[model samples]
Target: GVVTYDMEIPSKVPPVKLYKAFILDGDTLVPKVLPHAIKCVKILEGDGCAGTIKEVTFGEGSHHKCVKQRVDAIDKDNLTYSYTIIEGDVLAEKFESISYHIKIVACPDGGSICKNRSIYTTKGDCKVSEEEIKLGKEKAAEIFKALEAYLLANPDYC
Candidate 1:
């Protein structure tokens, strides 16, 4: 099964600025602003850029979730980024691998459009129904909405 979601933030910020804010390790920025949802984002090794390794922990009440991913690709000139999950509990149980791609495009009114796509592979013996994939896609969209709201309210970040 496959699923997708998209959104337009209508931001006055430049495409590159918005792309950088969206694609940067969530651990680096999420906890700083949305502490209720993100507990911490710790870099396990290397610099905090493409090819960096990191662990991200969610809030207190939820299960101690963690995900480790490597920067698979990045194109600053096109304001695009992609990454692959290397290891983790929540991710390993559900998917063999997962990739996320994001693109920031310019708008005619000097605004920017943000697009995000997530590719996931289910476990070998597991059969993820279409409804399950759709639900996951919705969840992903929710996360992006939260991010857009944060950036909209904090224009100084750019």
Candidate 2:
């Protein structure tokens, strides 16, 4: 069976507003704000649409230094995006690929809920550990919080 992880982060910002920082300007803003973790992001091919390939380079001391992902779907109007990691040291011979599906849904509190699901396609039955998954989730949460802060500080963005 394919292993998967799910995370839901509540944001004080609206769906469309949060979408700008999390998806639209994510490539540029993420590295700029957290350069120590994510060194840089480069669009290797195509625009920011389905089929676009983007490479992310991690900073020093990281277990993996690089990862390339291809966007499977990108819907600005619906506030949804999904991508699959096609190449990377993050695979570590255990995983064939990793796919991330993200959606921003408006909440009754006038904010939004960011739903993130990651599917890990492993090589054969070789599986990743819970500790590894925990670490990954922790890092992602940190990045999300940082991005949320950036959006809050720049209210006029968009």
Candidate 3:
């Protein structure tokens, strides 16, 4: 059996900008913005579309070294994107894969809300500890916050 987790993060960045930074320019901009957390990201196959695969290396502070992510869906018009973590030390023999669906929606204060759903598919009857989940959430929140800060500082950034 699989378990799913949902999280909502509110940001001061607008929806389009958030979506653009988080989804469109993610491969290139993320590493630049959060070098301490993400070492680098490289595209292994396809363009930035539904079939694209990305190889992401973590920074020195991380417990895991790298991960392979496959793009599942990208809806520019709807400001939504979906992807799966298919391989890496991050999986750590417990999970078969982790799938994420994210959507950016407008907030009243000219900001945006990130609605995220993460589905964890485990290996056999394996289970993930609570702290592991918190670590993942913390890392993801850090990335979003760092990107938001970068976007706020650089208005011309795409």
lDDT of 2 by residue, 63-107 (tens): 558889898888887789899989988877677778999988998
Q: Give the number of the best model, judged by lDDT.
A: 3
Give the candidate number with the greatest TM-score.
3
Q: Which ten residues in a row have the lowest lDDT in candidate 1?
A: 1-10
What is residue 156's positional error in candidate 3, in angstroms?
4.6
Task: Give one digit per residue, the lDDT tens place, for model 1 in 1-158.
Answer: 43233333455555755766766545566566665445677778776566877776656565447667777777788888777667876565457667777777987765587676666666664555667676656555555556657766664453
Error of 3 at 9 (Å): 0.6
The collision pairs in model 1 are none
Q: Once superposed on the true structure, which residue ranges of model 2 sit more than 4 Å away at CA?
A: 108-110
Regions more than 4 Å wrong, model 1: 1-13
Candidate 1 deviates by what RMSD? 3.3
Error of 3 at 51 (Å): 1.4
Q: What is the lDDT of residue 91 in candidate 3?
A: 77
State the displacement of the C-alpha of residue 3, model 3, in Å, after optimal TM-score superposition: 2.7
Q: Output the better candidate (2/3) by lDDT.
A: 3
Candidates 1 and 3, the one with greater TM-score: 3
Residues 38-143 of candidate 3: C-alpha lDDT, one tens digit per residue: 7899999999778799999888564558889999998987889899999987877677788999988998887888898888788885887888788888898888
